[PDB]
């Protein structure tokens, strides 16, 4: 992960102002609204018929929180996303059957949502650095697919 000493810095400082409960909720939420087919993996969450319904659903929110929570473990081991996310990789492949291609969709929605809560501060440079993180991650989750 060719992250540079400045980039790493840009990311972290920002990450430490992130309201985990909101961002995670919102991101998983906009994945279900924006890329509807993804709804197929959570058919077991409840009402996911409408925007308001997906945003408003408590399992989405909670799950959201766990997902962002894991995204967070990764930022604390940038020099080794592979190993952190190995178990979830296999998990996501052997039990859940998720085309790793959707991992990027979640990465981008997330960038989209961070841009959303921070307006200016999500200056282009900062954005680039998170594009990489989101990128290493998605790759780290696809790594144990077989």
């Amino acid at each position: 992960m060719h992250l540079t000493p400045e980039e790493k810095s840009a990311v972290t400082a920002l990450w430490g102002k992130v309201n985990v409960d909101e961002v995670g909720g919102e991101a998983l939420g906009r994945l279900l609204v924006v890329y509807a087919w993804t709804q197929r993996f959570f058919e077991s969450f409840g009402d996911l018929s409408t925007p308001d319904a997906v945003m408003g659903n408590p399992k989405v929110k909670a799950h959201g929180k766990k997902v962002l929570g894991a995204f967070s473990d990764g930022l604390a081991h940038l020099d080794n996303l592979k190993g952190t996310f190995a178990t979830l990789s296999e998990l996501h492949c052997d039990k859940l059957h998720v085309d790793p291609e959707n991992f990027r969709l979640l990465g981008n929605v997330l960038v989209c949502v961070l841009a959303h809560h921070f307006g200016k501060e999500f200056t282009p440079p900062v954005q680039a650095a998170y594009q990489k993180v989101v990128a290493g991650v998605a790759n780290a989750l696809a790594h144990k697919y077989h």
Partner: protein, 138 residues
């Protein structure tokens, strides 16, 4: 495919972009170059430094074509005909760079329309740049 409700949210979001289209276009272009350095290969005859004439003007060029598209939401292919022959025969750009440009527009719109960028608007806006992209790669 654009459903009426999408056309509606699009027609709206964009009308809030208003007289700032160009300013957002250029932000968006500046983000794409910084976030995905490869897209730079198509603009080797451009200065790509922070806040420079070409990007700022080419930015006007791009937002202005989206405006024309929003306007002609319901007939997109005809209205974009010229723009397509240019991105398919002359420049000939890989469809992929289009996903990147569109992501960035979204980040940008999402960046200055905090209230407007709702999960449904986020939605339709993505299906739109997706249709604008398809007609420029056909």
């Amino acid at each position: 495919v654009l459903s009426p409700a999408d056309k509606t949210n699009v027609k709206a979001a964009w009308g809030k972009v208003g007289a700032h289209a160009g300013e957002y276009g250029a932000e968006a272009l500046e983000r794409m170059f910084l976030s995905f350095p490869t897209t730079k290969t198509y603009f080797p005859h451009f200065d790509l430094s922070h806040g420079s004439a070409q990007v700022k003007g080419h930015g006007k060029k791009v937002a202005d074509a989206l405006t024309n598209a929003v306007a002609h939401v319901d007939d997109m292919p005809n209205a974009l005909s010229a723009l397509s022959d240019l991105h398919a025969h002359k420049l000939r750009v890989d469809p992929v760079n289009f996903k990147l440009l569109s992501h960035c527009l979204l980040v940008t719109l999402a960046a200055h329309l905090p209230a407007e960028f709702t999960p449904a608007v986020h939605a339709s806006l993505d299906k739109f740049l997706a249709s604008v992209s398809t007609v420029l790669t056909s």
